[PDB]
Structures are given as structure tokens and as C-alpha cells.
Symmetry: C3
């Protein structure tokens, strides 16, 4: 069944200023980069919210290790590395990204066995 769900909104211009946690692949895909980086930030945050959300009342247990990979058609897929890849070993992650005007968003759903 479902482990958790997360959603995130990111202000693109504010994110652009803040960045001045991403893989080479992400940075490559992004480079108008702010839009793309902001939606990848939202996606990492959605994944975190979905997982951490499943650990209600537990002590918390990262951003670079949640990688949005894109295929040749630009479809997003999450690839995990590091300590979170261990924790979410049997978990399937579904994500979707959007950016419209000044706002990026993402949703993630984690699903296990």
C-alpha cells in the first residue's frame, strides 16, 4: 500500500535568489535554470514529506541523494543514493513536477510492499 504522499510549492524568483544539493545530471538538465531547479527542489521536498510523514511520532532518520533523473523525453524519475536509499530500499517512488509563471510544484507518492 501507500507509504506517504508529499506536496511542495516553490517560489521560482525567490528560489533563484536563494541559490544565488543537486546532482550533475540535475544541474545539466536545468541549464531559465531557476524554473527547473525549483521544481527539482519541490520534488525532493515532496519525497521527504511523503517518507517522513510515514514516521509520525518517530525521531527523524539528504537532498543530493534524492535525484530527479530525466529520460530523453524529459520524464522525471527519482533515483535514490546514500542513507535514504537504504531506508527506502523496497519503496517505489512516483513523482510529478510542474512550473507555471513564478511557481513550481511537485507531488510524490511512496508505495511499498
Amino acid at each position: 500500500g501507500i507509504v506517504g504522499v508529499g506536496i511542495d510549492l516553490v517560489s521560482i524568483p525567490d528560489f533563484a535568489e536563494q541559490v544565488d544539493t543537486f546532482t550533475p545530471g540535475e544541474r545539466r538538465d536545468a541549464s531559465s535554470a531557476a524554473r527547473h531547479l525549483a521544481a527539482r527542489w519541490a520534488a525532493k521536498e515532496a519525497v521527504i514529506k511523503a517518507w517522513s510523514g510515514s514516521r509520525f511520532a518517530q525521531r527523524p532518520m539528504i537532498h543530493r541523494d534524492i535525484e530527479v533523473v530525466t529520460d530523453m523525453w524529459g520524464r522525471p524519475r527519482v533515483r535514490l543514493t546514500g542513507a535514504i536509499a537504504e531506508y527506502l530500499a523496497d519503496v517505489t517512488i512516483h513523482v510529478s513536477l510542474t512550473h507555471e509563471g513564478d511557481t513550481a510544484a511537485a507531488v510524490a507518492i511512496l508505495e511499498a510492499p
Copy 2:
């Protein structure tokens, strides 16, 4: 499988003016309160949309009874009371909240047996 999904956007400043349906726990968690109350409003609305959405072509069958509980780390979890707690007795609710600038949002997924 999945019962339904809901999403909701809430304008924070407009919500702030409108409020001038929340539990003591919610009101406590919220108190900058408008942001927090708006995302809790979005979460209640997402839950309603997910459930009611599963009743296509049926006569409709509440906000205080959909409580966003937070743990010591601020993770959200829905607790139901009242008549909706009866209707959704076997249903697991997954939620996620966000607020960025003037906009709050929430997503809910209901899952049954």
C-alpha cells in the same frame, strides 16, 4: 486500492480576512497563524474531495471532524471524529501540506481494503 485523491489551493491573505471548523489542537499548532490555518483548511478540503470524489453520482453524505494532528516534529496526520469517522472507518488517509508566499496547498489520498 485507492478510494480517491483531492487537492486544494488556498489564498492565505484572503483566508486570513475570511476567518477574521478548527480543533483546539489545530488552533494551538497555528499560533503568522493564517498560513497554518489556510494549509489546514486546504487539507480538510482535499480529504473531502478525495472521499466525495469516490461517490460519483451519489447523493452527498464536517470540517471540525477532519483534524490535522501534528507530532513533535510537525508532521501532519489526519484524525477523524463524528459522522465522517463512521463513513471512513476502514480508510487510511495520507496527507501533505505546503505554504509558500501567499498560497497554501494540500493533497490527500484515501486508501481502503
Copy 3:
């Protein structure tokens, strides 16, 4: 389990200008129409993202054929026709729509056997 998830944001005023892919039922339901058409556009896009998202690294395989039907209470439900109805034959689609101020959004989750 889950096939995919999609999310979409649509600027309502920009969408209104762009439209100047919808069924008679959708156009009827919509007619302040821009708001309603924008959320239906977001819903079609979310469905596409959820399905196409499940085809990572595959060659892509439409908008009129993803119909948001509403019941007498305005609950949304997707009805498929055409080539996508074939491709998604065994797939259950869950959707939710929202529009607040200048922004519409939608989320879709596809679920199979």
C-alpha cells in the same frame, strides 16, 4: 499498484487569453468559463503526466480523449475515449481539481492491476 501520478498548475488569465481539446460536456460544464476550462486543462495534463511518467525511457505513445465528466453535484471523473482509452484499458484514474484566484491546479493518480 500505482502506475503514475501527475500534477499541473495553470495560469487562469493566461489560459483565458490562449483559448481566445474540450468535449461538449466540458464546455457546457464550464459555461467565468476560463477558471473551469483551465482546471480541466490541468486535469488532462496531470493524467498525461501520470501515464507517460510510467513509460520512462520508452518512446511516447490526446486532450479531447481525456474527458472530465461531472456529476449533478459537480464531482469530477475522467472518462477516456480514442487511442488512450485503449492503452489505459485496465487502469483506474483518480483526479482532483482546484482553482483559487489566478491559478488552477489538478492532480491525477493512475492505478492498475
